Amino acid sequence: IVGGYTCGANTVPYQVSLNSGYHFCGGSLINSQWVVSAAHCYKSGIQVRLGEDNINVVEGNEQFISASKSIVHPSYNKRRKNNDIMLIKLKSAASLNSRVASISLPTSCASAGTQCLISGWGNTKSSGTSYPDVLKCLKAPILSDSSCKSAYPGQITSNMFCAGYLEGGKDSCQGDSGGPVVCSGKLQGIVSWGSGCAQKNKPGVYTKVCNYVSWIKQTIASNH
């Protein structure tokens, strides 16, 4: 996250870190056994780390649980980043508490101008790299269809929305991928892609979670 602020320990209790001996992507806990992240985050050997603040120090409240299933959308297209969504099933159920909590899936799509909370341990610099110990946060509005598509001619599908700031300076970034965009208490976005980070006229682009709710429900139901 570029241009954000320190969330404070466990204030985003559905934020998880995906770890393969290092932090590489975010995710969102949607029930005690399942995480939503980005398809582009797929790899084998995924460990899910819940209850994190400082990802470099054991502080208490951490729960680490291996992914037992990693399910990339069957239509995920890598070059176009279309359908950038992945479900992770945890080997065992997480213990849910004030510091490890699920986030609700939307019941409808959000609108342009809606203010959301985007969070992550991703790069904090739009020029060069700096990685934070503790979870960072950014409030950002959802942009109009027209603005999103002007920003990224060719590239915007209906499973994508832009959120953030055209003047530059405030964005998600590398390492935030798969992480949450939460608006009015609902998971509406998944950090997906953008051209650099926090660049003028180039806002972040996010997986449109409202289109995937039935797919999410169906995939879980059939992976019992």
Q: What track of x and - describes contact with Ca ion for positions 1 through 20 (by CB under 5 A)?
A: --------------------
CA atoms within 13 A on the CB side of 106: 19
CB of 121 closer than 8 Å to CB of 135: yes
- When the beta carbons of 9 and 220 are compared against Ca ion, the nearer one is 9
Distance CA 176, CA 154 (A): 24
**Is position 47 annotated in a ligand binding site?**
no
Residue placing its CB nearer to Ca ion in the complex, 71 or 134: 134
Are 143 and 114 in contact by the 8 Å Cβ rule? The answer is no
What burial class does residue 127 get, using C-beta atoms within 10 Å of its C-beta: 0-12 exposed, 13-18 middle, 19+ buried? exposed
Spatial distance between the Cα atoms of 66 and 3, rounded to a whole number of angstroms:
32
Site size with Ca ion, rule: CB under 5 A: 2
The residues assigned a catalytic role are 40, 84, 177
CB of 95 to Ca ion, least distance (A): 16
Render the burial of 21-32: b for 16+ CB within 10 Å, e for the rest. eebbbbbbbbee
Least distance from C-beta 60 to Ca ion, angstroms? 8
Task: Find out whether 154 is annotated in a ligand binding site.
Answer: no
Work out how close the CB of 171 gets to Ca ion at its nearest, in angstroms, rounded to a whole number. 25
Q: What is the DSSP letter of 167?
A: T
* Closest CB to Ca ion among residues 99, 202: 99
The answer to whether 32 is annotated as binding is no
- Tokens representing residue 45 in the block: 């050997």
Q: Is 62 annotated as a binding residue?
A: yes
Annotated binding-site residue? 57: yes
Considering only residues 27 through 86, tell me which ones interact with Ca ion, judged by CB under 5 A. 54, 59
Using the minimum distance from each CB to Ca ion, give the nearer residue, 59 or 145. Answer: 59
Residue 27: CB minimum distance to Ca ion, A: 16
- Per the annotation, binding residues for substrate are 171-172, 174-175, 177
> What are the residues binding Ca ion (CB under 5 A)?
54, 59
